[PDB]
Design a protein around this nucleic acid. Structure first.
Length: 93
RNA sequence: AGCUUUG
């Protein structure tokens, strides 16, 4: 099978936690890691986070399965992860 | 800290 795969997770209430995501995506694929985003200034949640799977096809499953799932009643978004530094970084000529 | 939005 393919190697591990990592996805974005969001649209989560602050009431959501890294522990719930552990039970959310695990039955779809063996979880290799999670990183729920938290504020540097207050340590509070951010309502989104990262998660890694043992297989890309198991991540792709938990993707379309939890994509719009009403976790705590709000549809959580899921999708592939990607760089974004080019969205705002710059350098002199 | 509340919302799709990304290390």
């Amino acid at each position: 099978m393919a190697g591990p795969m990592r996805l974005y997770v969001g649209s989560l209430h602050f009431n959501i936690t890294e522990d719930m995501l552990r039970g959310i995506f695990e039955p779809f694929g063996r979880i290799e890691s999670i990183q729920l985003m938290m504020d540097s200034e207050t340590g509070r949640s951010k309502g989104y986070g990262f998660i890694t799977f043992s297989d890309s096809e198991c991540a792709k499953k938990a993707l379309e399965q939890l994509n719009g799932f009403e976790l705590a009643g709000r549809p959580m978004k899921v999708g592939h992860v990607t760089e974004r530094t080019d969205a705002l970084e710059l350098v002199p000529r």
